[PDB]
Structure 1
Amino acid sequence: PRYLKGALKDVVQLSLRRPSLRASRQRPIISLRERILEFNKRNITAIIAVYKRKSPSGLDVERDPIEYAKFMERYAVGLVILTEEKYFNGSYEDLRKIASSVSIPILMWDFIVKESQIDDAYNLGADTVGLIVKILTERELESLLEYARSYGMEPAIVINDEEDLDIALRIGARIIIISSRDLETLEINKENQRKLISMIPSNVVKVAASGISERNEIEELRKLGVNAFEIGSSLMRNPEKIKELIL
């Protein structure tokens, strides 16, 4: 991984130390990219609902994974499931459980740093994974992207700045997550997010993340070319906000 410090470095040490999992995948690979695109053509708002019990940028929510997933199934273009243990209190089990209960596409969000964590996604039912630029060498990032593709997965590439984005373009990202929230400071910059978005080619699926909270924002960002929307903690709090958000 890259040279790091503080909370980030600590997540990446744990992730490297993280025990693999034995299991057989019992679902098909459902592409997140392809379904975002269907929603666009179908003129339906593409919301990606996140599941997380805890995050550094919210208060803890105790809530049933399955009940949440089954509920979002009626509405969301897909689900993000956190499986990072320390900072997000997530588990592979949340993934397994939800994966056996819904058949919308599932992205596993963790700090992915080695092949075996990709094996776990696959083995557990995840349709795809988040690859984090700020965390990986160009080499590792290219290496794990190829590896995810060997299973049939098309990973999302998560970005914050122009350097991130340039490296996503290097590897030929097909799906990019543009987060406005900095991993370290937790500062949100929507102005920087908008510029990043303007700089991304049309042929690439663009998902805006962090900070989104109302249909007007979603509408403004759609006019700017955004395809789908990762929405987290507020849906954890109030899952039925998504009916409002998809109008």
Structure 2
Amino acid sequence: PRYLKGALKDVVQLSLRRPSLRASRQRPIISLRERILEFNKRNITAIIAVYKRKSPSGLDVERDPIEYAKFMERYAVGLVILTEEKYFNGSYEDLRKIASSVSIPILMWDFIVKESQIDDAYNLGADTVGLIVKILTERELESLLEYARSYGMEPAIVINDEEDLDIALRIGARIIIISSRDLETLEINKENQRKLISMIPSNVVKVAASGISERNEIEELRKLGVNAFEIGSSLMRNPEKIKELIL
């Protein structure tokens, strides 16, 4: 991993020790990237709902993962499921249960630093994973990206600054998540997010993440070329808000 400090250093060290599991995937890879493009073709708003019990940027929400996923199956373009345990109170059990239950694309959100986490995602039924430029070297990003591709996954590459974006383009990213939330400071900077969006080539699918709460925001971002919209805490507290946001 890169040179880190504080909680990011901690989460990375914990991820390195994350026990791997054994399971048989019994699910095709269903592409998140492709379904986003299809939603764009059909002029229907593509919202990726996040399932997360805890986060550094919210109060804890205890709710049933299956009930959540099955509700979102009707409305969301895909789901992101937290499997990081210490800071997000996720588990691979949430992923297994959700993947067995729904037929929409699933992205596993964790702090991926070793190949066995990708094995875990695959074996549990996730369609793809995020890779986080903030915590990985160029070399690690290229190796993990190729490894995920060997399972037929196309990882989303997660960025929040220019240096991160340049590395995402260097590795041949095809789908990028531009998060407005800095992982270290928890600052939301939407000016910076828009600037990053403007710099992504047109053939890369662009997902805007964090700070999205209104249909008017989604409309403005779509006009700037954003393809889909990742939304977490507000849906965790009020899942049916998604019906307003897609209207």
Count of matched residue pairs? 247
Matched, 1:102 2:105: no
How many angstroms does 1:158 deviate by? 0.2
How many angstroms does 1:139 deviate by? 0.2
SS of the residue corresponding to residue 88 of structure 1 reads coil
What's the CA shift string for 1:72-107, capped at 9, x where partnerless? 000000000000000000000000000000000000
TM-score normalised according to structure 2 size: 1.00
What's the CA shift string for 1:139-185, capped at 9, x where partnerless? 00000000000000000000000000000000010000000000011
What's the CA shift string for 1:100-137, capped at 9, x where partnerless? 00000000000000000000000000000000000000
* Mapped partners of 2:184, 2:131: distance in 1: 17
* Mapped partners of 1:221, 1:143: distance in 2: 32
User: RMSD across aligned C-alpha pairs, in angstroms?
Assistant: 0.3
* Mapped partners of 1:63, 1:160: distance in 2: 29
SS of the residue corresponding to residue 57 of structure 1 reads coil
What's the CA shift string for 1:18-39, capped at 9, x where partnerless? 1000000011100000000000
Name the residue aligned to 2:140.
140
Name the residue aligned to 1:12.
12
SS of the residue corresponding to residue 100 of structure 1 reads helix
What's the CA shift string for 1:200-219, capped at 9, x where partnerless? 00000000001100000000
* Mapped partners of 1:128, 1:75: distance in 2: 19
What's the CA shift string for 1:24-79, capped at 9, x where partnerless? 00111000000000000000000000000000000000000000000000000000
SS of the residue corresponding to residue 122 of structure 1 reads helix
TM-score normalised according to structure 1 size: 1.00
Instruction: Please show how residues 117-128 of structure 1 align to structure 2 within 5 Å.
Output: 117-128=117-128
Tell me, which stretches of 5 or more residues in structure 2 are unaligned? none
* Mapped partners of 2:30, 2:50: distance in 1: 17
Name the residue aligned to 2:70.
70
Name the residue aligned to 1:226.
226
SS of the residue corresponding to residue 145 of structure 2 reads helix
Instruction: Please show how residues 95-244 of structure 1 align to structure 2 within 5 Å.
Output: 95-244=95-244
